[PDB]
Scaffold this active site. Sequence first.
Site, PDB file in Angstrom:
ATOM      1  N   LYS A 227       5.861   3.560  17.081  1.00 16.40           N
ATOM      2  CA  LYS A 227       5.758   2.475  16.120  1.00 16.40           C
ATOM      3  C   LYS A 227       6.918   2.581  15.141  1.00 16.40           C
ATOM      4  O   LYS A 227       7.121   3.621  14.499  1.00 16.40           O
ATOM      5  CB  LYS A 227       4.437   2.548  15.359  1.00 16.40           C
TER       6      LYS A 227
ATOM      7  N   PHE B  97      -1.312   8.382   4.244  1.00 19.90           N
ATOM      8  CA  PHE B  97      -2.029   9.065   5.336  1.00 19.90           C
ATOM      9  C   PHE B  97      -3.263   9.822   4.823  1.00 19.90           C
ATOM     10  O   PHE B  97      -3.416  11.012   5.091  1.00 19.90           O
ATOM     11  CB  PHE B  97      -1.126  10.084   6.067  1.00 19.90           C
TER      12      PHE B  97
ATOM     13  N   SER C 298       5.861   5.153   8.768  1.00 21.14           N
ATOM     14  CA  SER C 298       5.208   5.002   7.476  1.00 21.14           C
ATOM     15  C   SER C 298       6.228   5.198   6.368  1.00 21.14           C
ATOM     16  O   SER C 298       6.969   6.181   6.359  1.00 21.14           O
ATOM     17  CB  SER C 298       4.095   6.026   7.286  1.00 21.14           C
TER      18      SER C 298
ATOM     19  N   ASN D 289       5.848  -1.594  11.522  1.00 22.20           N
ATOM     20  CA  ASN D 289       5.110  -1.130  10.354  1.00 22.20           C
ATOM     21  C   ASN D 289       5.428  -2.010   9.129  1.00 22.20           C
ATOM     22  O   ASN D 289       6.080  -3.055   9.246  1.00 22.20           O
ATOM     23  CB  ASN D 289       5.500   0.327  10.070  1.00 22.20           C
TER      24      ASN D 289
ATOM     25  N   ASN E   2       0.819  -1.211   0.000  1.00 21.18           N
ATOM     26  CA  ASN E   2       0.000   0.000   0.000  1.00 21.18           C
ATOM     27  C   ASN E   2       0.848   1.253   0.000  1.00 21.18           C
ATOM     28  O   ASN E   2       1.950   1.282   0.569  1.00 21.18           O
ATOM     29  CB  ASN E   2      -0.954   0.031   1.211  1.00 21.18           C
TER      30      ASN E   2
ATOM     31  N   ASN F  90       5.400   5.905   3.430  1.00 16.68           N
ATOM     32  CA  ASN F  90       4.643   6.605   2.382  1.00 16.68           C
ATOM     33  C   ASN F  90       4.513   8.119   2.553  1.00 16.68           C
ATOM     34  O   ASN F  90       3.720   8.768   1.862  1.00 16.68           O
ATOM     35  CB  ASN F  90       3.257   5.963   2.229  1.00 16.68           C
ATOM     36  N   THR F  91       5.285   8.673   3.474  1.00 12.49           N
ATOM     37  CA  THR F  91       5.324  10.118   3.662  1.00 12.49           C
ATOM     38  C   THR F  91       6.790  10.515   3.670  1.00 12.49           C
ATOM     39  O   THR F  91       7.564  10.015   4.495  1.00 12.49           O
ATOM     40  CB  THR F  91       4.646  10.538   4.985  1.00 12.49           C
TER      41      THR F  91
ATOM     42  N   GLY G 209       2.376  -9.827   9.589  1.00 14.47           N
ATOM     43  CA  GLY G 209       2.193 -11.154   9.047  1.00 14.47           C
ATOM     44  C   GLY G 209       1.575 -12.176   9.980  1.00 14.47           C
ATOM     45  O   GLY G 209       1.770 -13.379   9.807  1.00 14.47           O
TER      46      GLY G 209
END
Length: 364
Positions: free
Chosen positions: A223, A117, A183, A252, A113, A185-186, A303
């Site tokens: 995290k 956010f 994350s 993560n 993914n 993705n940022t 997982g």
Amino acid sequence: GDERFYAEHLMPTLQGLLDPESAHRLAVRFTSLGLLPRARFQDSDMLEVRVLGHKFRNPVGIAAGFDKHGEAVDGLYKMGFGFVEIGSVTPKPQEGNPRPRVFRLPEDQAVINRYGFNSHGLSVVEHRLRARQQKQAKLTEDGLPLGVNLGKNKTSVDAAEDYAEGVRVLGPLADYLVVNVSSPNTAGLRSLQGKAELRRLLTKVLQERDGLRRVHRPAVLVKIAPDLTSQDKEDIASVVKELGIDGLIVTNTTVSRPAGLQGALRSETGGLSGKPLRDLSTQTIREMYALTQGRVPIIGVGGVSSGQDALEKIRAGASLVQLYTALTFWGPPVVGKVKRELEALLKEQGFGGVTDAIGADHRR
Ligand SMILES: Cc1cc2nc3c(=O)[nH]c(=O)nc-3n(C[C@H](O)[C@H](O)[C@H](O)COP(=O)(O)O)c2cc1C
Ligand SMILES: O=Cc1ccccc1/C=N/Nc1nc(-c2ccccc2)cs1
Ligand SMILES: O=C(O)c1cc(=O)[nH]c(=O)[nH]1
């Protein structure tokens, strides 16, 4: 709530109709409406854990990212999760990355993914949680705590202020808060895991947290990524102990692409979750538990799809576990499956309960 039926028929048919993001939105809708079998598994006392200032009637939670905006909390408890984490939530609303931004890798039982956010923002989530605040207080007292995962806006200059705002606005509504610095993705977010940035960021976060009234004062967890160097992990462990951080969430999604991935979509940008992440996450738990001398509670995630997967993380040092990706392949019955298998394995291995198994591998 037939495990075989959801796994063999229902989930594959929905997956064959809908792209992953549409399927996700629909799942959130169905969950929020209570359109699930009310899980028939009654939690055994063996599964109860006391940690983070709270009782958890079972150690299996839903990971952040499923209910990003706090819309399906009650339906998630109905599904059988012992605790629910919502988020990540950013201070202002934001759309996240352009579509498509979620991809299935069925051959690997994995997902990639790059949502980035997408978030309704603090204000909307705050009002949503306020509308059920007293119901949550009773759930928590009954052993079903709520966690809130905080993110930062894409165009934010001061990341620390983004997180501080989250603590001030949602801290009073949470049993625990998660500072999500992992994350993939940022842009620039994961560099907040570095020693200097992290210490400064977490000092501010804890100051803000300590400024909240006593009954509204959440535990604070960090995290972390599964892609950290040994140096990174040592530094995080050191900062966590220096500052009195309450716990860690490990881990993560991964930006790595392990050898052997078969999915056609394996080279899509984003964080990979599910089975290929499992042992990488478990090893990170093992390392963080050792570096913190078993004194810092760990929520293990990555997982998990069976009782064995859960117990391996618990024995490696996790006090609680979460899952997300397994739910997308097996559906809701996976929650009872994990709990029932975990109970059977604890008995097989001679543990009185979950608590006795926490960190057991380190005492071998
Ligand atoms: C689609 C998707 C969205 C996610 N969004 C978030 C998020 O917003 N915040 C966060 O901390 N983790 C997020 N995660 C990561 C999960 O919380 C979890 O750490 C990761 O997926 C590994 O667990 P799993 O293998 O059981 O899915 C997301 C994961 C997925 C697959
Ligand atoms: O399909 C891929 C996907 C990718 C990212 C996030 C969620 C999903 C799909 N999830 N599908 C789910 N369905 C349920 C569900 C809930 C209630 C009743 C039936 C199914 C829970 S999660
Ligand atoms: O919003 C995201 O894309 C997201 C955040 C996060 O923390 N982890 C993840 O895999 N994706």
